[PDB]
RNA sequence: GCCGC
């Protein structure tokens, strides 16, 4: 449970791009084609991307190289 | 106790009247209690009367002269049983009791004449560190209640025009997020809890619907429009002389 | 859609970042959730059946009722949205009833009261604006004002009062000079009941520095301090000085000690430390039994004696003016200006009662401490009340008129705790009638006024990164005669400075250009004799549609710089027009 | 090492008063053991109370009676203050008839086999005409706590007649407790300390069963901290899917494609299913007419599956 | 408006033709006045006299080109601030490149 | 909307709206009445020499402006003269001190500068103006209780209020009571006051559970026993908040001022269950539901028990005219009245045949429009009052 | 249905460090909560049987106020040290141990003479680091089992100072609860929602984990009963 | 319009 942001916000810092990455990650996690890469405690996608952004395992130039990965491999 | 109230709220008002009522009905549910209690062991009428003539005859130079001499015994009798709960004194509005008087009422009942007692606390046992200020306030029930106040809407019926939700209770209507709400939404940045308030939970008749299939289905999509206002809006200014029009 | 509104009430166990929601207030918000999971998980595959099944409110609805409010936020306003934080998300909490719990520590900032308010409740029933109500406008993110930089949640009233009383000292107590080994002897002992809360004691005390480069050392010794404040001392996080506990906390204080809490540690230890702030203030005032007799108003003694001779002036006067050497405006000012001095002396007097009326003996002979009375108390913690309000209810009521602007001659020489005649009465209800009406005829105005600042800024947004030009405005302490109002560290504080620094040596720069001002920058300054830094403003950026954000300074709500795409105009016109509710035009 | 309290001196000022003692206590135990006993007795303790009251001619509790003086919204009141004793049983009905002139009590209460009032002179009603005739049946049921009258919805499970008045029920005996902790007697020992327990109540329960019963609910709750340790619903899913009736070119199909029940059925999509070998148009939208006579679309999306 | 001639003045210094560039005096209004003649008409009709500013926008046949916070709130568009900062970033990109 | 010294004994200063009407509203004060030609006026006590007299003068707005008016609390001896040489007095639109001679009028009572609802406020002078003007606002929006209980600390002008408000029930040739009932009472009028011929009893039948503007309940309960005498003006029955006769419009709480656990934060209030348990601050609501059978050109519209299209169970709660029994609990969308409309179909289709044919003579072609209890809404049913036209067959209800 | 309460199912424990527990109970019905945790709270800060020194007897100036020699720390805080040391004493009311040191390093308890008997849960635990730069410090202090906290208020032990001046007046700190706390949360089993949840936060200084004076705390209140629980028993 | 904030 994330109930503060703030390291999440210093990860990448405007407090205004987060929530596009983590929106477009739980996009990703919830429609389909994507599985967490932290521990799901049975919470939500939202906040499962707020933590997975605060571990420093996901950020927008590694979801690019991984849509590019996806698209050149079909 | 049966009520428990704040202190904080008594300076900053300014209201005195809080206090000595609290008082002044502590004195006379003392007496009220004495009365009862001398009541309960079935003690002779003599010493009750006598009791209720002295209570009677308080005050410094009151111009109320009820005698008990004349009365019938069972209509003391009545009387008494009548003063059980409580003494029903009364002060007019702008001469009454004073300090002083409300002190030798609180002291013919055998009560504390400071007006506070010492309380203990109830979960844990332990005394309060202060005396408490504890007496009898009259307390009234205004006509609000959350019977009539709480209300939840997440789909209803739409005006013919505009296509907006229908507003207040008795019509199941929705909450209306005025301008300064619009404007703070704007200060905070959030665009996106914004556009979904001015679309798809108003005026987008196809938006409404689809977000409500996204939600049923689990998408938490938006898929936004054009709302129906701007539509209306563009039919009245083109119903004048006046040509306005969405260029590409 | 998606909007409900009750009535609102406290709740005191509740986090900074949670509220109280009815269980039938839900399940009516959240009914396309609930047909959803009962749908996916298979417990009804029409939707005519989930809907069925709601409307006859079965146990699993409710089981999937609090399985769906989980993690979604919710966003409570208040009805007149004066500014930005009028309308915040907290995380529901389930609870039996029909009003909603509101956590004391956001009234202040919702200006809510609970003698019969009401909020109105949103869903943000999107991804992206579930992100954005917990990532921007959750109760913990915003706890510095957009106005002024001062902290927004802060303890008041009760923990106010709780935490004062806690952090008092007697001259003479159960306990005197005793050591005790640290904070936990000490509450072991007041819950013990073998010591008083305001005993002067000696306790080892643990203390740590952030001196060291993102490094934190170690230091301890001995202090001398009361048994309460060695129980306050385990609540403030490590990191923090001792000289902060130390004080008598009159809601001054603690704001201060949250700021620096704020400005030293973080966010997440603010929260966490208002939430601990919160609960022992409230636990130790309902420990106190602080409670309001008619004992407590005592009226001075030498307060007949002063009304007898200002009305023996008052006749001396009156006798001079029936001889005929002076004119009625004469006299009028100088009946006013005794009766005024009257009241100031027969208020001084009051006060000096009231302050320092507590005489108990020590181990040797007697002395004289800050009184225990209960007004006194509330009023010199800040909790409740001023100096005028205790004036009015127990010093002379003083003189008033505002029938046409002009005063009566004589004065209302009695209080509230002794009665008011017919007269004096009916001469407050003009004071009463005047503030009252103009307190319902100035909201027209001040909205108005909000409307036109807000429309007249509406489209400024930070749309750049830095100009580059070099021009700027000159900052200079306000001076005004023989007072100063505003030195240059409130004036300059988180702005940018347009040219380099020059201390009074000359060719010796300070801080270079275009640099961001901070606490330790503005303490450097005062540190030497700067009086005047030349700084870059909003109308001097130079750049189009827009306004560059070095131009702009700091964000006040967040410490860091201000980033691109901020709505400034907007907050400049709330924070402007959100004061003139109360401005007396 | 630690002495023990014994229930000593036990003394009943009158029907509703009474004292409780316990001599022997240690420096700090009188306090705890008072507390938690006033609690335990305040909270909860067992007793009798007025569930409903069935009236001959009345319908609701907002109506009138000719020929007695009150309401029957005050006759239920002051039913409500009732004080009973039942032993063994937890269902007894309590018949009241009278007719006359006067002030009604609870002493011409039928007398029932196993019914103690406690107070006799509890008046009920008041009769004003000669000819006038009162008779009511009321229902006494054994409780703990406080129990509205609006709470319960169990007792709509069977429908009940138009003239049952529900009243609320209060089933504690106990009204008012305090304690005072004194000096003991005790010189031997060095400093020991003594309990006094004063309660009210109204004449339900006797004073030193109460201190029984609270104390063996204290210490059956007690109890747990002497040992810590501790460190796809619906039925026309999961059915086989040969219950369809479908065509036999269908039936070998779902056999090689992995179809077993009828849940897996409903979670495939259209255009991958058409895919499949030697399916058909025609047969596809037959196997759609046969679950669509079930009401269950193609398509549908569940969260787990068991293997039955 | 100020950003015009600043814009159209650097455009003339840029070239061999400095001279061109005009000198202007700057002009103050009130909070009122300088609402009412914003560029676009979109905004400042839903403020104050709409007959007003209608009339005179529809001789001069301007355009509103939804450039600020309030005329993206009445059509329901993303306004050009917070979140939304960056979609309006990317639409201007693609109307320049056609 | 300024209070004006001239207000003094007409209107109240303290009793008025909050927000758009504060100072166009305005309340009488208890004293003051209107003169012949429309202006108000106040009475004042005629000072002769140094003694006040007994006679009472009404004075107006021009009359008062020119004498000199003393203070009602303003010592006074045995004989009527003033115990003290300098009394405060109004002279015009001020105040100051003048002479034990220069008088002329005196005050009649202290409530003179006060409305009826600020006379119910004890400890009115140590109350700030403001709050004790929210204080007097509030008290008219008090809901009556299921019991009334008089005040502690009252003033002594709830007797004038109860009985000049005409909620009671007051006796006008008092005698003996005769005959007393929760729903009448008959007085037995004595011989000393009585109209020759015919003999004469006085009868007084109380308004029992009835629904008022507000939607609470207004009830007349007596307060005499049996056989026990009565004068005129005697009070015989308290309506709603009244208790023997007294204005009680609260109930009487023990309070203790003390901050609990922030429980009673800003302007909370803690309350225990004891308070719950006694049932006090309960309130009984009414509700009025109507339905109307009105005229169509397809045909007469008519109440029926029986509703096409409608389970046995909706019925259970309908007699046998379509109507709900007194004293059944409805609660939801419960149905109250049985009606149905008539539809319009002259062409009978094989389909239509058939389905008359298997069914009712109707088969359900007539439409239900029944009256059903609004949802959240739930109660007893009290009274029905079923109302029929001339010519029409009479309901059997 | 009647006399039959609710208990607690699924105890949470929270084990820190290795003093440090935090101890969750539910469901309790409402009201039981407080009166538990308060009755437990109150028999473990008040009333437990323990042992600690409550005599100090230094070689050379006997003082309250003393110059020390220069050992680098008060005698002050050289009592503050001796009174948070934790001895497990087995079998013995009372027992005398002394110790000496020399050589430039801290003294630790460890330093002190080890008896079979004595226990000393803390050893690393310093009294001193030695008089600045080389010198020597005998002491010899004295300890012995008690109940409660029992402050040094006054000795009335031997006659005169005698005895103060060979114990100094240490507060005696018998029972090992360094620490107790508990908060009463709201919890729900299914359609009831009034019930409480008990949450009990405890620190010992050792000798003892916590959920073992946890347990005492509870057998000698329950037991405690037994006068009135003992005949009226289930079994 | 009346009332509540
Ligand atoms: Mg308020
Ligand atoms: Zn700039």
């Given at each position: 449970a994330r109930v503060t942001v703030q390291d999440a916000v210093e990860k990448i810092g405007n407090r205004f791009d987060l929530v596009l990455v983590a929106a477009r990650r739980a996009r990703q996690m919830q429609v389909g084609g994507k599985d967490p890469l932290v521990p799901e405690e049975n919470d939500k996608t939202t906040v499962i991307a707020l933590r997975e952004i605060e571990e420093g395992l996901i950020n927008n130039q590694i979801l690019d190289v991984r849509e590019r990965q996806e698209q050149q491999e079909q | 106790v049966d009520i428990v109230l704040n202190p904080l709220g008594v300076p900053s008002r300014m209201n005195i009247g809080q206090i000595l009522e609290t008082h002044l009905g502590m004195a006379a549910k003392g007496i009220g209690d004495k009365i009862n209690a001398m009541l309960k062991q079935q003690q002779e009428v003599a010493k009750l009367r006598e009791f209720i003539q002295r209570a009677y005859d308080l005050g410094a130079d009151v111009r109320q002269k009820v005698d008990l001499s004349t009365f019938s015994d069972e209509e003391v009798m009545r009387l008494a049983e009548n003063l059980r709960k409580g003494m029903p004194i009364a002060t007019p509005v702008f001469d009454g009791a004073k300090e002083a008087e409300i002190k030798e009422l609180l002291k013919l009942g055998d009560l504390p004449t400071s007006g506070q007692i010492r309380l203990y606390d109830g979960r844990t046992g332990e005394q309060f560190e202060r005396p408490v200020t504890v007496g009898y306030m009259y307390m009234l029930k205004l006509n609000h209640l959350v019977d009539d106040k709480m209300h939840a809407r997440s789909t209803g019926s739409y005006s013919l025009v505009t296509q907006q939700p229908l507003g207040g209770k008795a019509q199941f209507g929705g909450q209306r997020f005025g301008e300064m709400e619009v404007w703070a939404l704007e200060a905070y940045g959030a665009a996106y809890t914004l556009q979904e308030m001015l679309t798809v939970k108003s005026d987008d008749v196809n938006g409404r619907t689809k977000m409500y299939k996204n939600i049923v289905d689990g998408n938490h999509q938006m898929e936004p429009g054009m709302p129906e206002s701007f539509n209306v809006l563009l039919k009245e200014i083109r119903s004048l002389g006046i040509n306005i029009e969405l260029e590409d | 859609d998606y909007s409900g509104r009750s009535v609102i009430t406290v709740g005191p166990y509740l986090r900074l970042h949670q509220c109280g929601l009815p269980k039938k207030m839900a399940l009516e918000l959240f009914k396309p959730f609930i047909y959803g999971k009962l749908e996916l998980r298979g417990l009804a595959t029409t939707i005519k059946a989930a809907k069925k099944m709601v409307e006859r409110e079965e146990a699993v609805v409710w089981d999937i009722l609090d399985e769906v409010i989980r993690e979604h936020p919710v966003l409570l306003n208040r009805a007149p949205t004066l500014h930005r934080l009028g309308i915040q998300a907290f995380e529901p909490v389930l609870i039996e009833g029909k009003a909603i719990q509101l956590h004391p520590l956001v009234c202040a900032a919702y200006n809510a009261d609970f003698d019969g308010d009401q909020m109105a409740v949103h869903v943000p029933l999107t991804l992206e604006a579930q992100l954005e109500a917990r990532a921007l406008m959750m109760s913990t993110n915003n706890?510095?004002?957009?106005?002024?930089?001062?902290?927004?949640?802060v303890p008041s009233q009760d923990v106010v009062l709780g935490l004062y009383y806690m952090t008092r000292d007697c001259v003479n107590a159960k306990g005197e000079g005793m050591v005790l080994t640290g904070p936990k002897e000490a509450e072991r002992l007041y819950r013990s009941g073998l010591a008083s809360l305001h005993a002067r004691v000696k306790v080892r005390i643990t203390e740590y520095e952030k001196d060291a480069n993102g490094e934190l050392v170690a230091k301890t010794s001995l202090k001398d301090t009361t048994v309460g404040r060695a129980i306050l001392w385990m609540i403030v996080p490590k990191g923090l000085p001792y000289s902060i506990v130390n004080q008598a906390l009159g809601k001054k204080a603690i704001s201060k000690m949250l700021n620096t809490c704020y400005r030293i540690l973080g966010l997440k230890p603010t929260v966490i430390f208002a939430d601990q702030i919160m609960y022992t203030g409230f636990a130790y005032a309902a420990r106190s039994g602080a409670s309001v007799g008619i004992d407590d108003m005592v009226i001075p003694e030498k307060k007949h004696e002063i009304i007898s001779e200002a009305e023996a002036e008052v006749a001396e006067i009156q006798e001079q003016f029936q001889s005929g050497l002076v004119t009625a405006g004469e006299r009028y000012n100088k009946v006013i200006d005794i009766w005024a001095a009257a009241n100031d002396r027969v208020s001084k007097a009051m006060m000096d009662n009231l302050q320092t009326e507590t005489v108990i003996n020590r181990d040797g002979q007697e002395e004289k401490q800050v009184s225990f009375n209960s007004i006194y108390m509330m009023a010199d913690s800040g909790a409740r009340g001023s100096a005028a309000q205790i004036r009015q209810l127990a010093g002379m009521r003083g003189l008033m008129a505002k029938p046409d602007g002009s005063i009566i001659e004589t004065p209302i020489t009695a209080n509230f705790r002794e009665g008011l005649n017919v007269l004096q009465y009916f001469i407050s209800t003009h004071g009463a009638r005047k503030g009252l009406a103009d307190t319902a005829l100035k909201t027209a105005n001040s909205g108005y006024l909000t409307r036109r600042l807000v429309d007249v800024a509406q489209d400024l947004v930070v749309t750049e990164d830095d100009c580059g030009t070099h021009e700027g405005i000159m900052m200079t302490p306000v001076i005004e005669g023989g007072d100063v109002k505003e030195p240059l560290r409130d004036r300059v504080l988180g702005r940018v400075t347009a040219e380099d620094v020059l201390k009074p040596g000359t060719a010796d720069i300070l801080v270079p250009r275009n640099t961001l001002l901070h606490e330790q920058w503005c303490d450097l300054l005062e540190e030497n004799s700067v009086d005047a830094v030349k700084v870059r403003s909003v109308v001097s950026c130079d750049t189009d549609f827009g306004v560059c954000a070095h131009c702009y300074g700091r964000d006040l709500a967040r410490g860091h710089i201000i980033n691109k795409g901020e709505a400034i105009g907007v907050i400049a016109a709330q924070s402007i027009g959100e004061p003139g509710t109360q401005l007396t035009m | 090492e630690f002495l023990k309290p014994r229930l000593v001196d036990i003394e009943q000022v009158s029907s509703t008063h009474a004292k409780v003692t316990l001599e022997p206590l240690e420096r700090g135990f009188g306090h705890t053991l008072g507390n938690a006993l006033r609690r335990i007795l305040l909270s909860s303790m067992p007793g009798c109370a007025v569930t409903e009251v069935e009236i001959d001619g009345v319908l609701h509790e907002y109506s009138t009676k000719e020929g007695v003086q009150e309401d029957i919204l005050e006759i239920l009141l002051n039913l409500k203050g009732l004080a009973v004793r039942v032993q063994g049983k937890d269902e007894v009905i309590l018949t009241l008839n009278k007719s006359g002139i006067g002030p009604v009590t609870a002493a011409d209460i039928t007398h029932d086999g196993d019914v103690e009032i406690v107070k006799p002179q509890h008046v009920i009603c008041h009769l004003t005409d000669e000819n006038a005739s009162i008779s009511m049946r009321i229902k006494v049921q054994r409780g703990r706590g406080y129990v509205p009258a609006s709470t319960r919805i169990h007792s709509e499970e069977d429908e009940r007649p138009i003239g049952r008045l529900l009243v609320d029920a209060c089933y504690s005996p106990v009204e008012r407790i305090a304690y005072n902790v004194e000096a003991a007697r005790v010189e031997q020992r060095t400093d020991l300390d003594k309990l006094v327990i004063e309660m009210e109540t109204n004449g339900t329960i006797d004073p030193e069963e109460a201190i029984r019963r609270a104390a063996t609910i204290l210490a059956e709750q007690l109890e747990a901290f002497v040992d810590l340790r501790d460190v796809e619903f619906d039925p026309i899913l999961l059915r086989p899917v040969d219950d369809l009736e479908l065509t036999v070119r269908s039936a070998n199909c779902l056999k090689a494609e992995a179809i077993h029940y009828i849940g897996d059925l409903v979670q495939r999509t259209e255009v991958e299913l058409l895919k499949t070998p030697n399916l058909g148009k025609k047969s596809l939208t037959e196997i759609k007419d046969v679950l669509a006579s079930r009401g269950l679309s193609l398509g549908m999306r569940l969260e787990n599956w068991p293997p039955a | 408006q100020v950003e015009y001639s600043r814009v159209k003045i650097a455009n003339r210094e840029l070239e061999a033709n400095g001279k061109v560039g005009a000198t202007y005096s700057r002009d103050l209004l009130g909070i009122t006045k300088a609402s009412l003649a914003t560029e676009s008409f979109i905004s400042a009709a839903s403020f104050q006299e709409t007959t007003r500013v209608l009339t005179e926008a529809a001789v001069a046949g301007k355009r509103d080109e939804l450039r600020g916070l309030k005329e993206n709130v009445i059509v329901g568009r993303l306004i050009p601030a917070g979140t939304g900062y960056a979609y309006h970033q990317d639409r201007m990109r693609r109307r320049a490149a056609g | 909307r300024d209070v004006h010294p001239t207000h003094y004994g007409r209107v109240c200063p303290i009793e008025t709206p909050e927000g758009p009407n504060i100072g166009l509203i305005n309340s009488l004060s208890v004293y003051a009445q209107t003169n012949e030609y429309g202006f108000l006026e106040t009475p004042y006590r005629k000072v002769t020499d140094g003694v006040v007299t007994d006679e009472i003068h009404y004075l107006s707005a021009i009359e008062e402006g020119n004498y000199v008016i003393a203070q009602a609390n303003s010592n006074l001896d045995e004989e009527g003269h003033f115990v003290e040489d300098l009394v405060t007095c109004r002279s015009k639109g001020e105040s100051s001190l003048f002479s034990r001679d220069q008088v002329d009028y005196m005050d009649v009572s202290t409530q003179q500068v006060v409305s009826v609802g600020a006379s119910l406020i004890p400890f009115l002078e140590h109350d700030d103006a403001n709050r004790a003007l929210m204080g007097a606002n509030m008290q008219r929006q008090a809901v009556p209780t299921l019991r009334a209980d008089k005040p502690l600390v009252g003033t002594g002008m709830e007797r004038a209020v109860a009985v000049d408000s005409g909620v009671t029930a007051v006796a006008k040739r008092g005698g003996v009571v005769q005959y007393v009932d929760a729903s009448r009472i008959v007085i037995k009028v004595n011989e000393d006051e009585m109209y020759p011929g015919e003999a004469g009893i006085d009868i007084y039948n109380l308004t029992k559970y009835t629904r008022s503007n507000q939607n609470t309940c207004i009830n007349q309960m007596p307060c005499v026993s049996l056989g026990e005498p009565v004068e005129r003006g005697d009070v015989l029955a308290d309506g709603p908040s009244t208790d023997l006769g007294e204005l009680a419009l609260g109930q009487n709480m023990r309070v203790a001022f003390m901050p609990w656990n922030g429980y009673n934060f800003e302007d909370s209030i803690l309350v225990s269950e004891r308070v719950v348990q006694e049932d006090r601050f309960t309130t009984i609501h009414i509700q009025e539901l109507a339905c109307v059978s009105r005229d169509t050109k397809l045909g007469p519209e008519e109440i029926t028990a029986d509703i096409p299209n409608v389970g046995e169970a909706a019925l259970s709660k309908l007699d046998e005219s379509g109507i709900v029994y007194i004293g059944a609990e409805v609660t939801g969308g419960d149905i109250l009245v049985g009606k149905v409309t008539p539809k319009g179909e002259t062409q009978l289709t094989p389909e239509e045949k058939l389905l008359r044919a298997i069914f009712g003579e109707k088969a359900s072609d007539v439409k239900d429009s029944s009256l059903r209890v609004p949802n959240g809404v739930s109660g007893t049913v009290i009274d029905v009052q079923v109302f029929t036209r001339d010519g029409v067959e009479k309901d059997k209800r």
């Open positions: - | - | 706890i510095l004002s957009p106005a002024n930089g001062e902290p927004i949640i | - | - | -």
